Amino acid sequence: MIDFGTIATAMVTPFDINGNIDFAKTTKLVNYLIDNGTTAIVVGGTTGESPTLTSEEKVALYRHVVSVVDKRVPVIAGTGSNNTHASIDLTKKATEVGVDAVMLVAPYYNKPSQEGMYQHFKAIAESTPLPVMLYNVPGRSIVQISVDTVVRLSEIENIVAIKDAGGDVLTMTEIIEKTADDFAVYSGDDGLTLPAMAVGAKGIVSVASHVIGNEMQEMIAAFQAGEFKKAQKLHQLLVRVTDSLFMAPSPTPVKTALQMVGLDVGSVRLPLLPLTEEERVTLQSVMQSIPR
Amino acid sequence: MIDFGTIATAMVTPFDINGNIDFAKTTKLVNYLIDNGTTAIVVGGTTGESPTLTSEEKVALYRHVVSVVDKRVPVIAGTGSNNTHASIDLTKKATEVGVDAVMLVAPYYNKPSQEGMYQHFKAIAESTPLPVMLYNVPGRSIVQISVDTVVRLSEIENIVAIKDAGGDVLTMTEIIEKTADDFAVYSGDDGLTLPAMAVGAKGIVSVASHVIGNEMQEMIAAFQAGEFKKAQKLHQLLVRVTDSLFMAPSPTPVKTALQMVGLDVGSVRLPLLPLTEEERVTLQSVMQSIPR
Amino acid sequence: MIDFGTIATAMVTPFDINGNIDFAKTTKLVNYLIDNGTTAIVVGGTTGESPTLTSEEKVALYRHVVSVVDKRVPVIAGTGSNNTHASIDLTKKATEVGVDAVMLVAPYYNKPSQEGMYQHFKAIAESTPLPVMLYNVPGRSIVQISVDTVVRLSEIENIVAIKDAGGDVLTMTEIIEKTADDFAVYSGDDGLTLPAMAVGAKGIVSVASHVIGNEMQEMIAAFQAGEFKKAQKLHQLLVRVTDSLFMAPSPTPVKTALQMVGLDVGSVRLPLLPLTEEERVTLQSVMQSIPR
Amino acid sequence: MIDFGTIATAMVTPFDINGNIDFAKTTKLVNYLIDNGTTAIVVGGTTGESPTLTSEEKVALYRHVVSVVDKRVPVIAGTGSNNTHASIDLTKKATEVGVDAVMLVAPYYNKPSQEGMYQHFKAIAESTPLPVMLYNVPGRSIVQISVDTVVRLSEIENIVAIKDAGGDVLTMTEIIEKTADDFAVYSGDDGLTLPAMAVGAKGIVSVASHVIGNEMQEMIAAFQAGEFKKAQKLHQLLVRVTDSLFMAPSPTPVKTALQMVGLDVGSVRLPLLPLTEEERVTLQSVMQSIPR
Secondary structure, eight states, X not given: OOOOOSEEEEOOOOBOTTXXXXXXXXXXXXXXXXXXXXXXXXXXXXXXXGGGOOHHHHHHHHHHHHHHHTTSSOEEEOOOOSOHHHHHHHHHHHHHTTOSEEEEEOOOXXXXXXXXXXXXXXXXXXXXXXXXXXXXXXXXXXXXXXXHHHHHHHTSTTEEEEEEOSSOHHHHHHHHHHSOTTSEEEESOGGGHHHHHHHTOOEEEESTHHHHHHHHHHHHHHHHTTOHHHHHHHHHHHHHHHHHTTSSSTTHHHHHHHHTTTOOOOOOOTTOOOOOHHHHHHHHHHHHTSOO | OOOOOSEEEEOOOOBOTTSOBOHHHHHHHHHHHHTTTOSEEXXXXXXXXXXXXXXXXXXXXXXXXXXXXXXSSOEEEEOOOXXXXXHHHHHHHHHHTTOSEEEEEOOOSSOOOHHHHHHHHHHHHHTOSSOEEEEEOHHHHSSOOOHHHHHHHHTSTTEEEEEEOSSOHHHHHHXXXXXXXXXXXXXXXXXXXXXXXXXXXXXXXXXXXXXXXXXHHHHHHHHHTTOHHHHHHHHHHHHHHHHHTTSXXXXXXXXXXXXXXXXXXXXXXXXXXXXXXXXXXXXXXXXXXXXX | OOOOOSEEEEOOOOBOTTSSXXXXXXXXXXXXXXXXXXXXXXXXXXXXXXXXXXXXXXHHHHHHHHHHHTTSSOEEEOOOOSOHHHHHHHHHHHHHHTOSEEEEEOOOSSOOOHHHHHHXXXXXXXXXXXXXXXXXXXXXXXXXXXXXXHHHHHTSTTEEEEEEOSXXXXXXXXXXXXXXXXXXXXXXXXXXXXXXXXXXXXXXXXXXXXXXXHHHHHHHHHHHHTOHHHHHHHHHHHHHHHHHTSSSSTTHHHHHHHHHTTOOOOOOOTTOOOOOHHHHHHHXXXXXXXXX | OOOOOSEEEEOOOOBOTTSSBOHHHHHHHHHHHHHTTOSEEEESSTTTTGGGOOHHHHHHHHXXXXXXXXXXXXXXXXXXXXXXXXXXXXXXXXXXTTOSEEEEEOOOSSOOOHHHHHHHHHHHHHTOSSOEEEEEOHHHHSSOOOHHHHHHHHTSTTEEEEEEOSSOHHHHHHHHHHSOTTSEEEESOGGGHHHHHHTTOOEEEESTHHHHHHHHHHHHHHHHTTOHHHHHHHHHHHHHHHHHTSSSSTXXXXXXXXXXXXXXXXXOOTXXXXXXXXXXXXXXXXXXXXXX
């Protein structure tokens, strides 16, 4: 039904001098992303510092991005947490501010079973008419959403997609095979963009598209074109740059990276800190290595 | 200055058939635990389903338990989350309902650095006059609080202890050595209580204590008296019982195990689920092997 | 300078009824592989039971295979162990019996350092005129050959290729980037053939080519042309088959598979065991699932 | 029936300037060990550089050591490899030269199943009248000997003990419970000596005993006596010294340390290397921190 395209951007949440949401800055970023290869936007996810956002802040931010986007591009809210009843609640608030879909992380910290996760997600999906996108992220939640559990959930009418940040393209290939062709499997690891599309992934849910969305769209087109040498050169830029962006807890690297190219998005909330000088210089070098 | 004894219990939060906090049963539980080896109570932590509790529910639970306990035993509130300012607010609210200390978990899901975790814990600790216990749990949070971070934090007057669910008694031994005598180190793995205390741990923060607390206090005392053959046999029982309480996601096994011995404290909130019949049968068998 | 093709095959070693090498069944196997997509043969390596072959056997086997191959395809001898001195000696015997390259595994069991491995591999390389293929297999040896370490070794004149079974195509990409264009990087994991070649890998050192060589050859031709539909359809057969060959320790599965499809190559030597009648049935129905 | 005592030492193999076995230094070392707390000797194991020994060197070293010890202490020869037939042969030769027992490591590199390891160890044990000590070392063989497998093997009459380097004192506790009283369980991890004996282990198969075997014997006595705070100071020294001994690949550090305390045993064979000047300086300072 819906189509998030090939690059959904996991959008930072810009903050002012005091650490409150900066809604004018949110408006420059949303416009820039759309002008630079972003085909769908994920609002208030991990990369949006969802942990330190309040539910009132999350809803303000969803409402504001819905307005500024203006149907140019689907808007996905990160309404999912480790509390099912809380997730049903924030899901309904995002629906009522007119977001286009919801992203639902695998619950973190409380280590649910596969059956437990199945009911979590079945219940939040039952709570909305909207399209749902699953988010598998063992590297933050510990648990995997097993291939079998995903295949079961795809069977549900408004569960349409999965961001798979498992780092394993063999697991993805199994999910593509065993799910219907209208179930869209997305990589959630930038550097695996090319190999995952190689095996059938529709695209990437990205963090590096904040700074190299055009190049990414280029890479994808060149690989779909059978121009492998072209794609591989761009693939390697993506990998280099992605690595510079996770040398410290994300999203401080990518917020700092955006500043270094004249788009200030403020700093970060504790427990995250700003880059050290050392860290700044290192990222700086990599941002300079980007061709123009 | 503050002493939590040998067995601090990570107390479940009893629920009714409709998943609401059952305060009468909480009273029954508090008094049972104190009559059966519990030397300190942790309220509203992981085992108490902190993830599915509202801020308002947590503070009401803290208050009830401060009131029931009536100073017989110290009361420790799990106020720390992956969000620092919110961890500060919850901590004030708990200070105000009369708790004796707070426990602060290593931030889950957002994956902070050691310097970020250092500033996290420092800030919460500087916000309260209460004693502070750390909580290392890489098996739920992914990150470890490093030994050196733990040591730096130990130097803060009101950071007086740590629960190390890290699974590694050599790391514990390094913390013990490098910290002053007045920093208390607890195991957070029931199965390791015996070997942890051999290397100089003060005791355990326990889940198995809900059902075999009397056998645990007895195990500790035999060890302390050099009755090694006795301690080994009880340790063997503790390891067998503890394993049976974590075949499904905690705290569900232990809430079932309490119902089996007469204290029915309800079920669990989503994304967690009741034991299956097959799962109950297995657990039953193990409880039926605890000596009378 | 030497060209191993898109599909090198890590050849099983046929044993007779008393467990000795079956030289006639070896002849038959070699001729089959070359007829079914294999572009280079790897003799007496992990998959050909190197741990249970005597050094005499290894050399008798290298000789015969060279004879039967008759220069149709490169022959690569598996002459590296975790003993540098013995690896030089067998590399020498191998050379005298006229193989075309040697393959050298990361030392297993003794856990050498990056610098130790560097000296291991540099010393074996310098002992011989032949081309050398490195073999990274942290899943059997535990240590990895680090990108920097592979790069330094690539600068050595006869070190021409790597087989990388580290399972990580992002490590692969980095070896490709930082090495000269004349350093061939092969996947050592069947299922990663397509994503690997996507990022610039030259091909695969395969086990599954024993039973689906032609299909893999077709998948690679499809992919190199830009026909991603048929590539992905065959990639999915590859992954399924590969998986069925690794449910019991290798090479017991693929030897058994060879017998099911019409080329019996005997059993294995201890500590390896025959598949259970039940493991047989399971594998047999994956084999019957291959389109004929 | 046979008693290896509290501290079996995993003995290094002294090499001369050319890398050949040094029998004069072997003799010096056996006598030093025996006067400094070693209650049994493991010859030609991992720590003795078995990978880079020839079969003939191994048996030569078994012989020399046997005749030097002159029945003063049991001699355990490390005849087990990842090849069952080879292991039967080496075991038959060790037996003819008069060792008291054999150690048998879980096969490395070829990744055998629990039932393959069962048949591998059974066949080898059946081949000799000598006592047999199992060796679990997943940090070098990747596979684990499962608790059930160990229990089956302990029913064999000449399979009388296990060195468990699995890092896990709870798997050790289970083995102890499930096997009979006459199956002895040692730690294979020095740092874990104290807490392993707490849970019922007979003692330690050790590397630190080459330099602080007197202190270990002191610590063990203190624990058995109930002088727990005295055992804990020695434990801290154990763990700290042990860690300096595994910063580079063992046994280069313990051979370095031996020279520092006046017992030169030469260097190591490739693929292992001498400590750097750096690594030496750092190890030295830990050796200086031992009380003399």
